[PDB]
Design an enzyme around this catalytic site. Structure first.
Site, short mmCIF file in Angstrom:
data_model
loop_
_atom_site.label_atom_id
_atom_site.label_comp_id
_atom_site.label_asym_id
_atom_site.label_seq_id
_atom_site.Cartn_x
_atom_site.Cartn_y
_atom_site.Cartn_z
CG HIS A 143 -4.72 -75.78 -60.86
ND1 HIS A 143 -6.13 -75.10 -60.84
CD2 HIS A 143 -3.71 -76.63 -60.08
CE1 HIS A 143 -6.25 -76.71 -60.87
NE2 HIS A 143 -5.20 -77.53 -60.88
CE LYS A 178 10.18 -75.06 -60.01
NZ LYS A 178 9.00 -75.57 -59.63
NE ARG A 179 4.52 -69.30 -66.92
CZ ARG A 179 3.84 -68.55 -66.55
NH1 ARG A 179 3.90 -69.33 -65.12
NH2 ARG A 179 3.11 -68.64 -67.27
CE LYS A 231 7.13 -71.53 -62.13
NZ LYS A 231 6.79 -72.18 -62.29
CB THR A 278 4.18 -80.85 -60.07
OG1 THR A 278 3.04 -80.94 -59.05
CG2 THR A 278 4.44 -81.60 -60.94
CE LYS A 337 6.87 -83.62 -62.15
NZ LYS A 337 6.73 -83.38 -64.14
#
Lengths: 811, 810
Positions: A349, A540-541, A546, A648, A652
């Site tokens: 990942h 998001k984290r 990010k 991911t 969604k």
């Protein structure tokens, strides 16, 4: 005994009557809970309902395991150190069609089923996308009738819950097992010993691992139901127990402590984290083999067993399987190695060679002396294969070695996973290519066939039917129910794009979800929201890469244009940012404090009005994702190209009527490829432009010099416009953006804001905007975890999926 | 709401229905256990059955609690460290009348209910008589309609299981909880904090107990059913948990995780700090639960609506803890708080000797319970005023009656605290309750006679007749019907049948069938031939010097010597059975067990002996085994040195079940022999008054060794290595004790003991006379029903009335 045939499941569940469900409910509340209506708490009513629902689960569950013992299918084992389950009550009902029956039964008993739904704690078993992936996969696996087991650890305390006090993240204990958990069953019968420390004796037989310290691994089982197919699979989670004893000294109280906290908490290189990895691996393997023997002949093992390695965390499964087969089962090394390779497969990942797991050898030598030996033997034999394939190339031996020479000797666990697995896969198309091209090129050049892609995916049950019933409802009307289990055929909707009735419907469902989510926000934090505004969400984290900081930059820019001319009309926006920061990560804590501070200035400024709001979403997690995702208009996917493997959250939002603003990165590439570049807000530098910019060198000051808007915000930030009580509070956020910005926020700024103006522009136009949403939803099919799992099944595990509704229960 | 009425117990598996039980059994195996007939184990089927019986029990439990919340009766609380519950399955089925129907249910499901019952673990909750007494009372108080709660600790690993290896006791952990306890209910919602250490701040308005360590007390509920009356009461047990902390200072907090948790791990038995923590823990969590329940207002209605029974001194801190909550937390003045206390509490004493009474040193109390020490000192000082008032000049009496005792270390006499904080002090046997008034506690009696009392122990006829001896219950219920079960005095009517051939042969037949069941059980583990025709000679109690199993050992070897001396003599065959656990670290008791098995190794394999004699040591003696060996006994050995036993509850079990008793004149023996008639009883040896005389003139063991040539040969055998050939002097410390420091006069009672055993041998030789005597014992035994005892508690102590009335449901 002929009489024993009457001990049966048959006459038990009866049917799902409103009279039956009421009966069982009173029965569970009174006989299982030992309460009555005079003392029952909403929690007790929740528990009663959960138990009433479980009975229908377990009935289908017994039948499925009976089916698997009869049919002896290839067993598939998914090893994960996290399982981001969320809630089960509603998921179980839709998957078993108990939906309306319970709804009605609860109503007749005089209780709101929703009130009860909100009482359930999010499962404290997972953390990020990795854990959510496994949860979606388990749902898909059950829905496609594969004989699959999820294996992991049962954490008592999960990872913290996040409170925000005065803009600051605090972490509390997730005590999700406080009142117990109706979904799990303890199996003290199947308790297994796990060994640690000790030493190796090389005697006549082979090698014996003696004088070890023992930890007990007790399993708890949780049912995982498929979509109305009556197959129920098992999630088996291991809990740690220390043995009980009686000696002149009790200094071995630490024993009890460091044995117990393997199952206490998630992370975060502690010796603990390694104990967790071994613990889960050792129990799971003994359990697998035990189940294999209850059909000794290990030639058929790879035909009856598949083991997936979600990242390197369960990587010790390879040496462990080698250990059991050679040391215990008296198999010779070569034969056991063959079994291992053909049994195991590995999913990566990670995009940077930094995130990849390495362990010091002095650690392994102390807690797992036997495993260190096996790892060494595996390394020497593998480096032989390499030397025969590339004679001469000395550098290759050292670049490919499991052992890594440096300031400290280390074992590279990714090199272990690759050497001991028959397939290796990346998790999105560009990701799998970078693996081949750079991260693992030496291995790819040795074994090209071994390297695959399996693009990630999401389950349409929880992430469409469950969380967006309104949207599922208006689709079913045009194309039927079949898409739920075959998402590929949302494509049919591409005919309804010029249909007017559908446009107003798709628009109505969105606005309604916006209303319901606007309400849930008020009824908790006292925070006023225009429910007509564009819903701009980044969930998001929190990380530097990010790029929620780029988001912030746009938010402050937008605010500045409102201050410059308060009379130019501007598309109203609620900007919502959510996500947990890791304790320790000083930079992430600061980003949160900033977001809350921006909000404090802009949300109370009289001139702004309701044209712009900034909200941090506290304690982001599955059940909250279920709420905000169907409510969003705009999905922020703004990571630096190259930093994401897949994503991911991605899919969604797309499945739920949101348009995307993102980079050509991760699975966005593939999403844009399905929707069409024109039905997507793609902006900023590409993976190639990044590589170009690190070549000529990234100076952030040469963007700062040419853009007066960026110059202005930097000023407001430094002067303390957003922290008038502590002006220099944000100094090190500025420092980084300016001097050691490893992720190029200033670079993509120019193009990001332009793109945001195209967004705002399109949103002024309800019809066009909705017609674009439609083209996103229709084309959302490839991203089902049903599709992802069908590919794992045929391409790696060697099993055929099946969508045949199993008989059962009251048959 | 009216919609909310539909949440009710009413029509939920209501019946005795072989049909519905079969329906429910299946529910539970599949839905509660997630097992099936392919996978299922005997243990699994037992849990399914346990769960089926449970559904019917909790129905009546919900109801008994609902019913208790309006009638608001005077609640009774029985505090006990131990609860010797035993197994729960059939005691439950007989009390709800489900036995027959479950039998049938399980039989037509291809299953055997006898097997399933053997799977259940003995509750790891008790140790000896004191624990079993608490358990008999709970059954009785539910049977007599009382509003009673049992409060104790939930010990995770109870007190050890006993295993004999090489004839040595070894202890294994008892995880009776390994597969869970289907009988109990976790109540995590009712967790209470319990406080340790800290210090005392005296503020103007009141004292504070601050800076304390906290341990969490989590209650577990177990239902205790009445006999066929549908009152199901509560046993609530506290389980200790540590709070969850989640840093800098240091992780000595890991010690206060473990120290916190072994409050609840194990029973006892140095004079541990831990013991004291255990005593406060159960007391503190319990008093908060009481008060709590008493508010779902003023404390004027407290000695009338609440009753606290202290079982021994172990829960004595309740007196000073009650005073703490009432003064510190509830703001009553010391007088109003004292008045409530001294009337709320009653104390039961179980000991005979002054150094058996609990005494905590103060340095210990000062550290762990500082506020409680101040209250004790305060309690003491006032009490002493009353003594100096009612006894002027007498500076010689103050020190004798002080709660503060001045030894080598300064100590708090916990018994005197109990006598002061309660209105009734009760004894446990008529002779025992008198020696309290006579010597041990005279000063307190010559100051409060009204206080002191007697409540002779009893035993429940449910577990100890109907349940363990269905054969004997049947033949009795054939003559006089079934009312005796809940009214044991009706057994008086059996005096009429003493000369009835049928009844006589019926009694002998059950006894003989009980011996056959037991001989079979035996022949399995302990792979030895048991002669089911031999006299079953059984002694089961704690292994202790004063309990005197060494006296029994000497008879056994005497008997042995005679057979080897005259192998053609007719001798009545005997199976000698001795059982009981030895306190770990009590070395002499470990040696006694080794001596019993070593006698066994010789006698059981001597070819000249044949099957005239056998010596079995009964391994891991506990409630469920008691209920197998008691119905099978002919002779009950009750041979403690006279004056050492307050009561003796097992005595009454043997009596109820067809055994005759060989015993000294002590404890419950007196009221047994008085009740049965002296010549229906084998009495031997020194009486209490005879013992004094030997302590008056001195006890010298040589002048018994000198006059008795058989006693001699035995000692020479032990010393020479007869019973220990590989290790000749293994029993030297036993010989030494018998010779020079026998504190309990084994020799002195020898002649008289062995003479009396010949008289038992002679009577057993006449089966008709033996049985008529047995009849006489059984018929005369109703006075020892714990239904009787409890009634004298409710009336003369608690101030409630017993009711035998039914309760409906639904």
């Amino acid at each position: 005994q002929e009489k024993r045939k009457q001990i049966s499941v048959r006459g038990l569940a009866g049917v799902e009557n409103v009279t039956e469900l009421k009966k069982n409910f009173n029965r569970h509340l009174h006989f299982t809970l030992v309460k009555d209506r005079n003392v029952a708490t909403p929690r007790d009513y929740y528990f009663a309902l959960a138990h009433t629902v479980r009975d229908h689960l377990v009935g289908r569950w017994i039948r499925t395991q009976q089916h698997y013992y009869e049919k002896d299918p290839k067993r598939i084992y998914y090893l994960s150190l996290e399982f981001y389950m969320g809630r089960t009550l509603q998921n179980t009902m839709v998957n078993l069609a108990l939906e309306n029956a319970c709804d009605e039964a609860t109503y007749q008993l005089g209780l709101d089923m929703e009130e009860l739904e909100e009482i359930e704690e999010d499962a404290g078993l997972g953390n990020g996308g990795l854990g959510r992936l496994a949860a979606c996969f388990l749902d898909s696996m059950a829905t496609l009738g594969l004989a699959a087991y999820g294996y992991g650890i049962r954490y008592e305390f999960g990872i913290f819950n996040q409170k925000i006090c005065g803009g600051w993240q605090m972490e509390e204990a997730d005590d999700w097992l406080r009142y117990g958990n109706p979904w799990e069953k303890a199996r003290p019968e199947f308790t297994l010993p796990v060994h640690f420390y000790g030493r190796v004796e090389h005697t006549s037989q082979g090698a014996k691992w003696v004088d070890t310290q023992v930890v007990l691994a007790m399993p708890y089982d949780t049912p995982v139901p498929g979509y109305r197919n009556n197959v129920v699979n098992t999630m088996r989670l291991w809990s740690a127990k220390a043995p009980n004893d009686f000696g002149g000294y009790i200094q071995a109280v630490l024993d009890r402590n460091l044995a117990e906290n393997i199952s206490r908490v998630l992370y975060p290189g502690k010796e603990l984290r390694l104990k967790q990895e071994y613990f889960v691996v050792a129990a799971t393997l003994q359990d697998i083999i035990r189940r294999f023997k209850s059909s000794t002949n290990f030639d058929a093992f790879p035909d009856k067993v598949a083991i997936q390695l979600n990242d390197t965390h369960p990587s010790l499964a390879i040496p462990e399987l080698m250990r059991v087969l050679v040391d215990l089962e008296r198999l010779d090394w070569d034969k056991a190695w063959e079994v291992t390779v053909k049994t195991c497969a590995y999913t990566n990942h990670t995009v940077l060679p930094e995130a990849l797991e390495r362990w010091p050898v002095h650690l392994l030598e102390t807690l797992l002396p036997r495993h260190l030996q096996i790892i060494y033997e595996i390394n020497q034999r593998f480096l032989n294969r390499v030397a025969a394939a590339f004679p001469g190339d000395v550098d290759r031996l050292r670049r490919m070695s499991l052992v890594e020479e440096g300031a400290v000797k280390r074992i590279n666990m990714a090199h272990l996973c690759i050497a001991g697995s028959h397939a290796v896969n990346g998790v999105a198309r560009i990701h799998s290519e970078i693996l081949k091209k750079t991260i693992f090129k030496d291995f790819y050049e040795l074994e090209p066939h071994k390297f695959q892609n399996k693009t990630n995916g999401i389950t349409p049950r929880r992430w469409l039917v469950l969380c967006n019933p309104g949207l599922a409802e208006i689709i079913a009307e045009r194309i039927g129910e079949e898409y739920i289990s075959d998402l590929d055929q949302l494509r049919k909707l591409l005919s309804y794009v010029d249909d007017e009735a559908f446009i107003r419907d798709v628009a109505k469902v969105k606005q309604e979800n916006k209303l319901k989510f606007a309400a849930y926000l008020e009824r908790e934090y006292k925070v006023h929201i225009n429910p007509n505004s564009l819903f701009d969400v980044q969930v998001k984290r929190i990380h530097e890469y990010k790029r929620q900081l780029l988001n912030c930059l746009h938010v402050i820019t937008l605010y500045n244009r409102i201050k410059k001319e308060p009379n130019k009309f501007v598309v109203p926006r609620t900007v919502m940012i959510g996500g947990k920061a890791a304790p320790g990560y000083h930079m992430a804590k600061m980003i949160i404090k900033l977001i809350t501070a921006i909000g404090d200035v802009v949300n109370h400024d009289p001139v702004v009005g309701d044209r712009l709001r900034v909200i941090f979403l506290e304690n982001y997690r599955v059940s909250l994702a279920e709420k905000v995702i169907p409510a969003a208009d705009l999905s922020e996917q703004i990571s630096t190209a190259g930093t994401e493997a897949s994503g991911t959250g991605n899919m969604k939002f797309m499945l739920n009527g949101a348009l995307t603003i993102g980079t050509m990165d991760g699975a966005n590439v593939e999403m844009a490829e399905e929707a069409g570049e024109e039905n997507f807000f793609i902006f900023g530098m590409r993976v190639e432009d990044v590589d170009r910019l690190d070549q000529r060198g990234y100076n952030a000051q040469e963007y700062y010099d040419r853009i007066p808007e960026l110059r202005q915000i930097i000023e407001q930030l430094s002067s303390g416009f957003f922290s008038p009580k502590q002006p220099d509070l944000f100094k090190d956020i500025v420092n980084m953006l300016m001097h050691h910005d490893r992720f190029k926020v200033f670079a993509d700024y120019e193009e990001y804001v332009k793109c945001q103006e195209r967004v705002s522009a399109l949103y002024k136009n309800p019809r066009e905007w909705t017609r674009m949403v439609i083209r996103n939803i229709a084309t959302s099919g490839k991203f089902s975890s049903d599709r992802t799992i069908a590919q794992y099944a045929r391409e790696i595990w060697g099993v055929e999926p099946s969508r045949q509704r199993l008989p059962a229960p009251d048959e």
